[PDB]
Design a protein around this ligand. Structure first.
Ligand SMILES: COc1c(C#N)cccc1CC(=O)Nc1ccc2c(c1)CCCN2C(=O)c1ccccc1
Length: 333
């Protein structure tokens, strides 16, 4: 058994389905956001308590902790704005309008070195997610746009972004199923390939950074070789409840339906294990791909996860459509 489960606790302060649930860079705080636009910032070690609690007037689509300034949280709205929120002082330092005509801020990634952030801003969904979008680099010192990257072949909505460890590479996944790797020294697309049939939902660098991992609408987890121009290394069909749509039905003829928006997978510190969503809780696999552990503890579908390691103890966040967030403590035996 590669982990001992030291316990499972529950944060229940949200009354609506969770959209995002992310541990901060210190590994000591969570920022969580539900579909009613309630943000909660809470600690959990050694006990859970709420440090800040606010309700967004604006609809929010994305959430990203700052790297070099621990207590800063970037919030991306659906009305074309980014709020830089100070979790300690419990106030915004600034809001910036990003771009006209592209109001959905679908993704935010703070540079490792703290000096920049990346911003994905998309057009309205059609009245589907096959719509133009832009990927933008912003200077954190001045909170102004540095540049707009090219998106070949055509502008499209980028859903997810992730930096490598030293911030010189950025991997991205788009609503057209395309992955793009950007070199952040020259600030250009180095590499692009068709990764999923349907949307890419999450991307991540492997620990050694020889491959990147994606998960997408076709229900697949795929590992790609970013030395050999995004040739497949390995591929797996996850159960359909790992990628949704996630559905909570009542006996009423009423139901809630959520498509992925927040992270769909998370990794241990060494990138040997991977947490995913399921109807009943988190499911952890060992990366080669075999099932390892089902964490359970949810009465509604899990729609987003996170995994943080500090002090070589793991914390797994699993967040469900009833607003419950489970916190499972893992120590590598
Ligand atoms: C490296 O640290 C990070 C990180 C990280 N890591 C992430 C995101 C931002 C920062 C740095 C940061 O806080 N930048 C920042 C904050 C506020 C303001 C501006 C830039 C320029 C426009 C508006 N503005 C002010 O009105 C203002 C308020 C008080 C004092 C001075 C200016």
């Amino acid at each position: 058994q590669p982990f001992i489960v030291l316990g499972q606790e529950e944060y229940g302060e949200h009354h609506s389905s969770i959209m995002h649930c992310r541990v901060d860079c210190s590994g000591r705080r969570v920022a969580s956001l539900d579909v009613d636009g309630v943000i909660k910032v809470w600690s959990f070690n050694p006990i859970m308590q709420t440090k800040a609690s606010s309700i967004s007037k604006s609809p929010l689509l994305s959430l990203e902790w700052a790297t070099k300034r621990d207590r800063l949280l970037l919030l991306g709205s659906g009305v074309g704005t980014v709020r830089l929120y100070d979790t300690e002082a419990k106030k915004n330092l600034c809001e910036i309008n990003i771009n006209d005509n592209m109001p959905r801020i679908l993704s935010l990634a703070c540079s490792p070195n703290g000096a920049s952030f990346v911003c994905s801003a998309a057009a309205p969904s059609l009245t589907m997610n096959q719509v133009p979008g832009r990927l933008l680099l912003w200077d954190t010192k001045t909170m102004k746009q540095q540049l707009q990257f090219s998106l070949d072949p055509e502008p499209i909505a980028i859903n997810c972004t992730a930096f490598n460890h030293n911030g010189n590479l950025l991997v991205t996944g788009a609503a057209d199923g395309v992955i793009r790797l950007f070199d952040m020294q020259q600030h250009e697309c180095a590499m692009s390939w068709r990764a999923h049939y349907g949307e890419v939902y999450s991307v991540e660098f492997s620990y050694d950074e020889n491959t990147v991992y994606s998960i997408g609408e076709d229900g697949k987890f795929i590992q790609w070789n970013i030395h050999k121009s995004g040739l497949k290394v390995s591929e797996y069909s996850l159960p359909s409840d790992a990628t949704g749509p996630f559905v909570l039905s009542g006996y009423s003829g009423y139901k809630q339906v959520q498509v992925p928006r927040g992270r769909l997978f998370a990794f241990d510190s060494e990138g040997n294990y991977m947490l995913t969503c399921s109807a009943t809780g988190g499911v952890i696999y060992k990366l080669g791909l075999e099932s390892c552990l089902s964490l359970g503890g949810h009465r509604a579908p899990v729609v987003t996860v996170d995994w943080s390691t500090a002090m070589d103890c793991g914390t797994c966040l699993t967040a469900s459509m009833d607003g419950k967030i489970k916190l499972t403590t893992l120590l590598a035996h």
